[PDB]
Write a protein that binds this DNA or RNA. Structure first.
Lengths: 415, 43, 52, 411, 74
RNA sequence: GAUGGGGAAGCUCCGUUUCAAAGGCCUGAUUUUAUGCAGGCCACCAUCGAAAGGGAAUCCGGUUAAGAUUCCGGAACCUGG
RNA sequence: AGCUUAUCACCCCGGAAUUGGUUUAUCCGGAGAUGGGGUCUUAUGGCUGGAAGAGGCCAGCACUGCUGGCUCCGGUGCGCUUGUGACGGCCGUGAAAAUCCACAGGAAGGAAUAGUUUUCAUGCCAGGUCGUACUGGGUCUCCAAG
């Protein structure tokens, strides 16, 4: 009765009249006929076709995910007991030591299998300082060096701890200390913390990406305009900008797996610049407003884009500037998506605390579109402060996925 | 889809407002008629 | 301009398509000051009426 | 050619605004809507609203230009002007004081006829039957309403006569197939040449006439439906070889004043039209003899009315709380038996509707997708979500019905 | 005229099946001479030209062309 | 320069907004002594006048017995639906 | 048609005078300069497509066209035409309309077998008539090599 008119499909309350004589008259008969007459000559008539398709028919007939196994299905190891929230992850090329970085000003390394906090180092004495904190850490892809880059504030710190052994550590240190924004030799405190060299620009190092060559790496400096991206080389302690004029704020930048070009992931676009001539090779127009992280297939044939606005997209460098396919399923911002280095798999991370893993075949030369299908919904992360899986990295050779979250507890997932 | 043909009718907007306005107008007209009948008997 | 998108023709601002945002600030400040003075004028009127 | 303005071609001139249509027709909204109802014209919604409405976003109503243009040639438009002129001249005579002149003018006036409107609106006879549902509903509603200052007594009498003639024709041919009883009233679904026409029949009880409704539109609708039903009935009688108009026995009209009053004469093909064959049913005072008598007459034999001058029967219909005498020569059956018999069509057993016995309820005769949905597009995702919600809401119809049945089964 | 570096976009344009003919232009240049070549198709709105430098890529593109599309040289 | 006017016997002259009833937009359930129409807003008011004024858009190549931003080939751009 | 590209101008930090910046021309800065960091107006230039398959410059034969190369990389103004950007002032504050575009505005409309919006991209159809030949001391007019 409280409902308004025109939302009264049942225009009366059915009653169980025991006898025909008890049936009363109807006073609303005039109203119903009046409404029908008005609708007949006043209701706009629109021609339409009523759908009758099966509701489940819309689901694509993709191959069953269980037939594409193995893929991660459960969490097998947890790096609990962390003082701060693990913002970043870094798996070494050998896939033996997993480095972690948090806002507590301490970088911790956890074994992939045993999970023991073998080694630690402190970057900022003021762990509670809100001005700056550890932004990101990345292991050097080149082997036989064991160099861990640690981005804290403006200071980019290269760390070579005693984990890997004298000879490898000696080679790494010699690689770092070969020079005889600005580069400054480590101080006594930095040397005690195993910091081999310090690099500091004007802006903070919000992101970092290494190159397989083992010498070149790039950093992203938001709120820097022209200097939003800088290219650095360890072999000569030299810094250069990828191009003379960067436009807008930039979130991420990663080198091509083998080509001499650097991908720049602008706030709204992803662009390819050839470092040999510093010329804009191509521009990508993703179907998302604000990209979060950039990812490149190891074969270099397909690109993956992630966006904070609930959007994660698959990009093909040969199909068109627009994404090949747009995926939107997460309940919160997609923090990061990382390709698998060897296996044809990739997974996405979001602030909702749920991780998804997708199988993806990338034809090297066949003129066929890639086949990407979901495999399994991974759960176990705890959503805190509207945040979830801050970072996630796949194993260099196995189908295992490391994870990091705001709950001050990194995790590792295994089949 | 093989959707079957049909002819949809769009909502007749302001129907409830028109009904309420007519009810108010009917009540006002009845009151005015009663008042006029009262007044016309004292002339 | 009949075919260019409104994004290029209009900036994301109030009075964006016809003002440089400098005089927009001036007129906003002027309107706020006018409202404050009108409140002050009403207060003065109330004070005057309190005696008559 | 030179530049062509945007709002001068396409939807801009394909549809004319209602306000613009009225101005073009130079006819008052009342007369314009009367003509629209007579011609059965309706508004239309283009795929783009601003484009049709000269680029202006307003809740404008759009009408097809061709239909309005064709309307302008209707003689009814000239007849309306003639009626207006006659009314003005009659008011002139009344104000002057020469009543005789007004009577002479009235004796000369003739009313327009919608015969040519019906021909174009319904090119073929089956079309009229295919849409006579609304006409029958309106006529049956008006026939039971009491005359007031708005609706004249003659109009209601004519509507009742038309309804009685239609009922007599239906009973004589026994075309009733399905019937139903509801709160809104009794429903009849006859089969006129295969059209399965349905028409509501409200109970013969007083109905309140609220001032909210406007009978002016209803008056015009009934005026059109009167001619429509007259022509349909004449065609049906001619096809069936029955004389038209069917005369009525005044003696029966004084006693019953209904179905049996009209004695239709010239000058059986379905089980529903054979139920109660050669049977005679007695009807009590409580039951609505008007509804019951028509059903029995259409289905089988005649009926003996409870009315008298104020037995060889086999069944008796009574709805008294307690049976009075229950003579062995009359079978006692509740009124629900007739409706159930018609619905089933096979003379449902009478041992389930004895007087005082509980009546049976009356029924109207009429896992991996969770992940796979990721690859679905935004529009496809929304469509699938809407389909899932529509399935869930429909599942409630069964869930809440089974739950309530379980609750009822406790006692 | 327009130039596009999307190989798959060019393949889709050729796969449209609504194009009567296509043309491949052979060119010569040097930086160490190389046999630069171009692939061109006719579109409803504008002509689309694809620049190809590697001979193997040109051969693969030619192979990918559906047999229903005629390819006039030069 | 009509338009509504004035003078002139008249062929006609004045006057361009001149004290003209000088049109152009929208709404309503169909307007209550019963289906003849109610309400909301603005107050200007034709036309001609420029191929040197403003403007929507074609570039190249070739071709003839005379024509090329027009004819042919290629590739372009504007307006409306 | 796709990338790159602006003197001027605008925004933030900074607070000068111990007076600084700068044009050929000398005006500006506590009404916010020198200095440091960002924004876009993209005229005009650089690369690519159109596009070398075009034109031109050569060479051989047929004896009526074909067949083979180059069509490249620079410097420069007391020479000349033109456009563009900010300036110095003069005294006459400096034509109209059509057409297009811009904003204060928040009535109107937006949902579960296809809710609204289409200034994003693509696909589809159409654009009448008039003149276009030539010529052009006694009409006007556009380019002016060493």
């Amino acid at each position: 009765e409280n409902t308004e008119y025109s939302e009264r499909e049942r225009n009366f309350i059915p009653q169980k009249y025991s006898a025909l004589r008890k049936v009363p008259g109807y006073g609303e008969s005039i109203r119903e006929r009046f409404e029908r007459s008005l609708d007949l000559y006043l209701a706009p008539r629109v021609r339409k076709n009523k759908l009758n398709i099966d509701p489940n028919s819309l689901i694509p007939e993709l191959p069953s995910p269980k037939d594409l196994r193995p893929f991660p299905i459960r969490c097998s190891t947890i790096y609990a007991g962390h003082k701060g929230k693990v913002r970043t992850l870094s798996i070494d090329p050998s896939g033996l030591w997993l480095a972690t970085g948090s806002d507590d000003g301490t970088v911790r390394v956890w074994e992939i299998l045993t999970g023991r906090e073998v080694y630690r180092t402190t970057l900022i004495d003021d762990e509670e300082n809100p001005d700056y904190h550890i932004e990101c850490i990345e292991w050097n892809p080149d082997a036989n060096n064991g160099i861990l880059a640690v981005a804290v504030g403006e200071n980019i710190h290269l760390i070579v701890p005693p984990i890997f052994g004298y000879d490898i550590e000696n080679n790494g240190k010699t690689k770092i200390e070969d020079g005889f924004a600005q580069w400054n030799k480590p101080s006594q405190k930095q040397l005690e913390k195993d910091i081999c060299i310090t690099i500091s620009c004007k802006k903070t190092v919000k992101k970092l990406s290494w190159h397989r060559k083992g010498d070149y790496f790039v950093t992203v400096q938001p709120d820097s305009g022209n200097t939003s991206v800088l290219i650095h080389q360890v072999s000569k302690h030299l810094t250069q900008s990828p191009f003379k004029k960067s436009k807008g704020i930039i979130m991420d930048a990663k080198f091509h797996p083998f080509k001499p070009q650097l991908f720049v992931c602008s706030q709204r676009y992803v662009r390819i610049y050839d470092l040999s001539q510093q010329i804009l090779v191509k521009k990508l127009l993703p179907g998302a407003r604000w990209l979060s992280k950039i990812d490149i297939h190891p074969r270099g044939d397909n690109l993956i884009a992630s966006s904070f606005d609930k959007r994660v997209l698959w990009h093909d460098l040969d199909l068109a500037s627009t994404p090949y396919k747009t995926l939107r399923y997460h309940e919160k911002a997609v923090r990061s998506v990382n390709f698998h280095k060897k296996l044809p798999l990739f997974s996405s991370a979001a602030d909702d605390g749920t991780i998804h893993v997708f199988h993806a075949t990338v034809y090297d030369d066949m003129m066929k579109n890639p086949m990407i299908v979901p495999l399994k919904k991974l759960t176990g992360h705890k959503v805190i402060n509207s945040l979830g899986v801050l970072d996630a990295i796949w194993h260099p050779r196995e189908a295992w996925l490391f994870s990091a979250g705001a709950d001050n507890t990194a995790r590792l997932w295994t089949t | 889809l093989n959707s079957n043909p049909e002819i949809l009718l769009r909502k007749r907007r302001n129907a409830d407002r028109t009904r309420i306005e007519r009810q108010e107008l009917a009540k006002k007209k009845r009151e005015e008629q009663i008042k006029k009948k009262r007044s016309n008997k004292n002339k | 301009y009949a075919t260019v998108s409104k994004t290029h023709k209009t900036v994301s601002r109030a009075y964006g398509g016809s003002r440089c945002a400098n005089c927009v600030k001036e007129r906003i400040i002027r309107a706020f000051l006018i409202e404050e003075q009108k409140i002050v004028k009403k207060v003065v009127k109330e004070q005057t009426e309190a005696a008559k | 050619m030179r530049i062509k303005k945007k709002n001068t071609r396409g939807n801009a001139r394909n549809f004319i605004t209602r306000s613009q249509a009225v101005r073009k027709l130079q006819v008052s909204l009342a007369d314009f809507r009367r003509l629209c109802i007579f011609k059965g014209i309706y508004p239309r919604e283009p795929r783009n609203k601003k484009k049709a409405n000269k680029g202006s976003t307003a809740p404008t109503t759009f009408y097809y230009a061709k239909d309005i243009q064709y309307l302008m040639h209707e003689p009814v438009l000239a007849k309306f002007r003639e009626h207006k002129t006659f009314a003005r001249k009659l008011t002139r005579a009344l104000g002057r004081g020469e009543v005789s002149s007004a009577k002479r003018l009235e004796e000369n006036r003739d009313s327009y006829t919608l015969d040519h409107i019906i021909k174009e609106r319904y090119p073929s006879f089956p079309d009229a039957i295919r849409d006579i549902d609304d006409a029958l509903n309106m006529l049956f509603l008006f026939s039971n309403l009491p005359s007031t200052n708005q609706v004249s007594s003659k109009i209601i009498n004519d509507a009742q006569k038309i309804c009685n003639q239609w009922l007599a024709y239906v009973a004589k041919e026994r075309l009733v197939r399905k019937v139903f009883v509801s709160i809104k009233g009794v429903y009849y679904q006859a089969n006129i040449k295969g059209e399965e026409v349905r028409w509501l029949v409200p109970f013969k009880f007083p109905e309140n006439i609220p001032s909210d409704v406007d009978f002016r539109i209803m008056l015009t609708f009934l005026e059109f439906y009167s001619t429509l039903l007259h022509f349909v009935l004449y065609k049906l009688y001619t096809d069936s070889g029955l004389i038209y108009p069917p005369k009525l026995d005044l003696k029966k009209d004084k006693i019953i004043s209904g179905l049996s009053s009209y004695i239709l004469e010239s000058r059986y093909d379905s089980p529903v039209a054979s139920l109660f064959s050669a049977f005679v049913f007695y009807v009590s005072r409580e039951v609505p003899i008007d509804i019951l008598e028509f059903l029995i007459l259409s289905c089988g034999g005649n009926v003996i009315s409870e009315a008298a001058m104020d037995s060889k029967v086999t069944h008796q219909i009574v709805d008294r709380p307690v049976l009075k005498n229950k003579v062995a020569g009359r079978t006692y059956i509740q009124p629900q038996w007739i409706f159930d018999c018609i619905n089933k069509g096979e003379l449902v057993p009478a041992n389930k509707y004895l007087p005082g016995e509980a009546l049976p309820p009356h029924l109207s005769p009429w896992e991996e997708k969770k992940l796979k949905m990721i690859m679905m597009s935004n529009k496809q995702k929304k469509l699938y979500k809407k389909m899932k919600y529509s399935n869930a809401k429909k599942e409630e119809q069964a869930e809440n019905l089974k739950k309530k049945k379980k609750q009822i089964a406790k006692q | 005229a327009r130039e596009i570096t999307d190989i798959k976009q060019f393949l889709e344009l050729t796969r449209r099946a609504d194009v009567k003919t296509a043309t491949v232009k052979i060119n010569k240049k040097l930086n160490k001479p190389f046999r630069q070549t171009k692939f061109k198709v006719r579109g409803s709105s504008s002509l689309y030209t694809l620049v190809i430098n590697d001979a193997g890529k040109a051969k693969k593109l030619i192979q990918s062309l559906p047999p229903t599309l005629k390819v006039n040289r030069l």
